[PDB]
Amino acid sequence: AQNPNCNIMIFHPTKEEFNDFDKYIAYMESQGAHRAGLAKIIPPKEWKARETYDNISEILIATPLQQVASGRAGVFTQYHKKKKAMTVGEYRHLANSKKYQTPPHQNFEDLERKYWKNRIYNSPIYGADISGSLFDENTKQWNLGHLGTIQDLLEKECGVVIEGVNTPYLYFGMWKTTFAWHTEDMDLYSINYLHLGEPKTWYVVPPEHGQRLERLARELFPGSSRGCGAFLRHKVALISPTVLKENGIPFNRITQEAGEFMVTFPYGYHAGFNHGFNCAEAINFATPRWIDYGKMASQCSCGEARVTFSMDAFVRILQPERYDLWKRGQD
Numbered sequence: 001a002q003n004p005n006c007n008i009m010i011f012h013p014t015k016e017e018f019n020d021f022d023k024y025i026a027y028m029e030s031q032g033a034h035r036a037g038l039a040k041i042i043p044p045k046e047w048k049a050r051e052t053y054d055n056i057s058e059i060l061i062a063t064p065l066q067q068v069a070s071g072r073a074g075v076f077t078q079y080h081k082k083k084k085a086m087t088v089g090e091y092r093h094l095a096n097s098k099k100y101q102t103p104p105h106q107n108f109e110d111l112e113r114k115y116w117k118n119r120i121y122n123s124p125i126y127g128a129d130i131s132g133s134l135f136d137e138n139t140k141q142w143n144l145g146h147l148g149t150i151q152d153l154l155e156k157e158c159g160v161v162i163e164g165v166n167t168p169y170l171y172f173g174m175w176k177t178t179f180a181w182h183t184e185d186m187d188l189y190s191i192n193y194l195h196l197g198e199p200k201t202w203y204v205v206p207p208e209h210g211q212r213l214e215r216l217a218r219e220l221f222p223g224s225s226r227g228c229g230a231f232l233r234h235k236v237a238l239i240s241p242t243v244l245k246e247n248g249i250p251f252n253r254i255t256q257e258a259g260e261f262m263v264t265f266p267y268g269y270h271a272g273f274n275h276g277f278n279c280a281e282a283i284n285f286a287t288p289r290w291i292d293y294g295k296m297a298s299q300c301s302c303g304e305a306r307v308t309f310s311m312d313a314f315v316r317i318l319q320p321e322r323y324d325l326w327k328r329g330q331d
């Protein structure tokens with residue numbers, strides 16, 4: 001079996017190998033990359049996402065989210081308080097302010113230490129889940145706005161024809177902005193490209209061990225667990241690497257830098273934080289190997305997780321028994 005220790009793999013495709021997205025994902029899995037739950041792909045040196053970022057300040061963050069934490073440094077929840085709209089120019093200036101900027105630090109490890117020590121005492125502002133793309137339309141390779149759609153994958157594999165669309169989202173981060181422990185909707189893959197700015201640190205649990213993380217989370221967030229059978233779908237719970245190590249949860253960590261892609265694999269729990277002002281673009285995708293994960297994916301039926309138009313159809317076709325009780329939560 002390839003990659004039996006479930007290490008995060010880093011790939012360096014050639015420009016020739018960067019032409020066929022599906023085929024390269026299949027290659028990475030042939031080498032065991034999915035066992036980690038997360039892979040890093042460094043694009044060929046010849047490739048560019050776009051010519052420059054020189055006009056990005058005019059993008060609007062309609063609903064910036066202030067991420068307020070509750071709990072202890074290693075085990076906390078975050079709630080998202082909606083703030084007034086601001087441009088990316090305004091946001092970048094805010095990120096660079098004395099109140100919000102990255103603190104002095106020696107290296108990524110010292111900054112990771114400062115994050116876990118001090119995250120809970122601050123409320124950074126995240127511009128998340130903004131529909132859009134920063135890939136140039138003339139970028140033909142690994143353009144996250146030109147991927148094959150999940151609906152088309154389901155049609156190719158299963159013959160069924162469903163409504164829904166699949167588009168990318170932009171994320172504007174600052175120091176301490178946080179993504180809580182989660183898998184993707186319907187345990188899809190994701191791909192994330194860090195367009196510009198400061199790094200993003202990721203933590204991931206191998207898919208084969210995801211249930212271990214879930215069991216820990218029910219012990220650590222016991223009232224949340226009683227309220228919903230899939231509360232990690234709410235995307236509010238954080239657990240530090242120290243706490244994971246204390247409880248024997250297998251995980252890995254890696255830092256993504258500007259210009260790099262990350263791929264999360266089906267049922268690969270992940271969480272992380274931003275080091276400073278940055279902009280990432282991400283989208284869900286499917287392969288044939290996903291279909292079984294989609295059939296088995298948990299769902300939030302408490303009604304908090306409140307999910308997309310397109311996820312309806314996935315549930316309806318792959319999980320017809322759930323369909324009924326799941327859409328009572330989403331209506």
Ligand SMILES: O=C(O)CNC(=O)C(=O)O
Nearest residue numbers: 171179190191192280282
């Ligand atoms: O970049 C972020 O804040 C969160 N990204 C993801 O969880 C992802 O790409 O799957």
Ligand SMILES: [Mg+2]
Nearest residue numbers: 055056058059
């Ligand atoms: Mg602009």
Ligand code: NI
Nearest residue numbers: 183184190270
């Ligand atoms: Ni994700």
Ligand SMILES: [Zn+2]
Nearest residue numbers: 228300302304
């Ligand atoms: Zn729920």
